[PDB]
Swiss-Prot record:
This is Palmitoleoyl-protein carboxylesterase NOTUM. The gene is NOTUM. Glycans are attached at N9. The keyword tRNA-binding does not apply. Its EC number is 3.1.1.98. It comes from Homo sapiens (Human). Rarely expressed in adult normal tissues. The active site is at S145 (charge relay system), D253 (charge relay system), H298 (charge relay system).
């Protein structure tokens, strides 16, 4: 199991001011480190954050966290469950900031909640250097759903932090799972007046101001003041990134469909769904490290059965291993770019049931 450590710097906090933290299982023979960001939506104003505190409190506070957690999927230490990185040092960072890992604002006389996601990642990295990370050769920052978007927003900052601290030999890389969203037209639509009616772009623009949210520097410089919300969308931020990033994305992601107001399918909805798959596939055509099956699902990398899905005969653990080999051009029988071309959910027989 992975063991809980609360941060020694207790000024870096979850939403309610309790200390943030991480779960760790060391592997002393290994110089590989996997730091995984949890997901779980977000909140963007006082009223909706208050509701989240009543019934989603573990995503806002460490008060009730358990002392241990079992590693699953890519966080498993058994080769049977994790063919890719079973011998690595494993870290699970709980999401308790409700800010897509972007925030840098403390609780104060002016702020009911703290939004410190960007500062939590930096503080975890700092405290791990004293526990073995100083001797690493590869640090893979991974994450699912809001945590996948968090990888995109934070991977280059982790790289800059380690360089400035004097560790230029640690190779920082990202693995973004189910965090690559489209700011597309919705299937049915409403003007932004509450949580359920506010479209992704309008909700993120309000959140960024509420959280004091920060985005990667090169993307910020392209879009400029007031337009930083654009950098939460993978196809817009990815081209600006310098660290290698592997992108895992279902073509018909369930969270994407929910934000699009989609739930015996007639012509209009058939065309909408087929167009969404085509648009997603278009955005990945120049992403050389990617895995994108034609399934209706959400998240995969910490699921126990993540080994089952294949694209063109290649599983996800195999694709990631091929990525590792490519970063030692293309490799015989060891592909890294795997995107389905069939146009309807479950046209791939390996999709999750
Ligand atoms: C849509 C989006 C774009 C960029 C960055 C983050 C985003 O949203 C993450 C998320 O988790 N959304 C969600 C909405 C309702 C129910 N579940 C999930
Ligand atoms: C605690 O965290 C803040 C914010 O990341 C940092 O600037 C500060 O120096 C830390 N405190 C100590 C004693 O390192």
């Amino acid at each position: 199991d992975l063991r809980l450590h609360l941060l020694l710097n207790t000024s870096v906090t979850c939403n309610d001011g309790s200390p943030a933290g991480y779960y760790l299982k060391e592997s002393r023979g290994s110089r590989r480190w996997l730091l995984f960001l949890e997901g779980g939506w977000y909140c963007f104003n006082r009223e909706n954050c208050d509701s989240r505190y009543d019934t989603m409190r573990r995503l806002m506070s460490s008060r009730d966290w358990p002392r241990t957690r079992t590693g699953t999927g890519i966080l498993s230490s058994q080769p049977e469950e994790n063919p890719y990185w079973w011998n690595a040092n494993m870290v699970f960072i709980p999401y308790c900031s409700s800010d897509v890992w972007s925030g840098a604002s403390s609780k104060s006389e002016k702020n009911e909640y703290a939004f410190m996601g960007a500062l939590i990642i930096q503080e975890v990295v700092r405290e791990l250097l004293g526990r073995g990370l100083s001797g690493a050769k590869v640090l893979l920052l991974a994450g699912s759903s809001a945590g996948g978007t968090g990888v995109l927003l934070n991977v280059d900052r982790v790289a800059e932090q380690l360089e400035k601290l004097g560790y230029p030999a640690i190779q920082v890389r990202g693995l973004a799972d189910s965090g690559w969203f489209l700011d597309n037209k919705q299937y049915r639509h409403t003007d932004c007046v509450d949580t359920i009616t506010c479209a992704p772009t309008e909700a993120i623009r309000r959140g960024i101001r509420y959280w004091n949210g920060v985005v990667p520097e090169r993307c910020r410089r392209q879009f400029q003041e007031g337009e930083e919300w654009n950098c939460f969308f993978g196809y817009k931020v990815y081209p600006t990134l310098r660290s290698p990033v592997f992108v895992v994305q279902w073509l018909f992601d369930e969270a994407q469909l929910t934000v699009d107001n989609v739930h015996p399918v007639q012509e209009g909805l058939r065309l909408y769904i087929q167009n969404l798959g085509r648009e997603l596939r278009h955005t990945l055509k120049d992403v050389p490290a990617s895995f994108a099956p034609a399934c209706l699902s959400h998240e995969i990398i910490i699921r126990s059965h993540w080994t089952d899905v294949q694209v063109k005969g290649t599983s996800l653990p195999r694709a990631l291993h091929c990525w590792d080999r490519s970063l030692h051009t293309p490799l015989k029988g060891c592909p890294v770019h795997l995107v389905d071309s069939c146009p309807w959910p479950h046209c791939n027989p390996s999709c999750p049931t």
